[PDB]
Design an enzyme around this catalytic site. Sequence first.
Site, PDB file in Angstrom:
ATOM      1  CG  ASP A  28      -2.568  -6.078   0.333  1.00 41.73           C
ATOM      2  OD1 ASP A  28      -2.014  -5.021  -0.191  1.00 41.73           O
ATOM      3  OD2 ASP A  28      -2.368  -6.200   1.627  1.00 41.73           O
ATOM      4  NE  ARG A  47      -2.340  -3.540   2.383  1.00 43.78           N
ATOM      5  CZ  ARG A  47      -2.843  -3.416   3.432  1.00 43.78           C
ATOM      6  NH1 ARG A  47      -3.137  -2.467   4.388  1.00 43.78           N
ATOM      7  NH2 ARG A  47      -3.828  -4.323   3.532  1.00 43.78           N
TER       8      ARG A  47
END
EC number: 1.14.15.1
Length: 405
Positions: free
Chosen positions: A242, A177
């Site tokens: 993720d 991220r």
Amino acid sequence: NLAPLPPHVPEHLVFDFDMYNPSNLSAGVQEAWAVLQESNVPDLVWTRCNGGHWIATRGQLIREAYEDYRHFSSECPFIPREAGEAYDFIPTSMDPPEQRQFRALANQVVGMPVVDKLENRIQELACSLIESLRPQGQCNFTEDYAEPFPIRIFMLLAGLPEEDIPHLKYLTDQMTRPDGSMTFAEAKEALYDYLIPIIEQRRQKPGTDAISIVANGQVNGRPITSDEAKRMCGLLLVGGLDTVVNFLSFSMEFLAKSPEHRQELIERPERIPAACEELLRRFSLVADGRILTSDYEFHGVQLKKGDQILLPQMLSGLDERENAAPMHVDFSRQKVSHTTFGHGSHLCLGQHLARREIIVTLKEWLTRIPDFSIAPGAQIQHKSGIVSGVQALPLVWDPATTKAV
Ligand code: HEM
Ligand SMILES: [K+]
């Protein structure tokens, strides 16, 4: 910002899709990518966004390119090019034939038999998380259930201490991220700095955890190097994070928004494995790709050595040529076709673990908290990229409708 159109790319193939911020995002990430499948869009297009790259938009071409590793190499598998070049995880940055035996070794630590040994911890973890949330009548599902879940399962596989979780989460988030404060390379090295000492320790004094097995493995005729083990362990850690977090969130968002689909799985729990598959198709979320090894004509389009091609795993199952009425969710769907876990030589090794994580979550959530809704007035925000996802998922329920254990 639009990269200069390369001379070999014809005007008629240009569609400036931005995989990190697509036009229709606020209306749903899958919907935003599905614009590439409208009838005026060619099967293979060039976008000038994010440095410039091809995009295959149809399942047929996505599958074909994933099979043809000779022309479509994993050496540079991400857009933008700079990320793709820095990326050296194993086996995802390697092509067959070399990749085959590294993939075999990774399969020992995440494949089928290992899944059955983990099942109890998976179910235990799911239950404990859900019970902690149940009487509160609200959570942010993404933050409170989805995020803690796969990292915990990985620690158990890898024999890493529980107290390491927040640091390891910090390191992995920093990589997957990115906020622009670190290069991809810097974030990768920070992760590697955690793994290096552990690999050293477990080559001297091995156990039976995944890191010990990988770090002491044999590949292509010789023992694995410390470097190769590090590059493998990086992927084994991040591959399941993720993807699972975001996929669970898409699934729970859909179920919160569809009482009739919830009730279906409540009344008919034997349908949950099938529902898992249909949700994998509808809420597919990965989009990586390949780099051209040579000039090559592919379905009538001239591709040049070194061109990048995005081959979105997400798009195959959304393609109306593969599944009729592709945006409609049908747990009774007959031939559920998708490439959610990829295709060809790199087909996800974690797919069996992932399905157990999904199915256990759905089964345990629906039996403890059968009725839940999106918080009123909340608008769910999606994010788009290599792994598309959900920013936050605020859910509410009346605790009086819930079942303690
Ligand atoms: C919903 C969850 C998941 C999705 C959608 C997913 C998706 C994918 C995709 C699309 C690929 C192929 C990438 C490429 O061809 O470049 C891949 C590979 C891989 N996945 Fe997953 N994955 C998931 C969960 C997991 C889990 C839980 C693990 C466990 C560590 C895992 C481990 C791996 C590994 C090791 C590879 C590389 C295989 C190779 O390169 O030979 N995945 N995954
Ligand atoms: K690379």
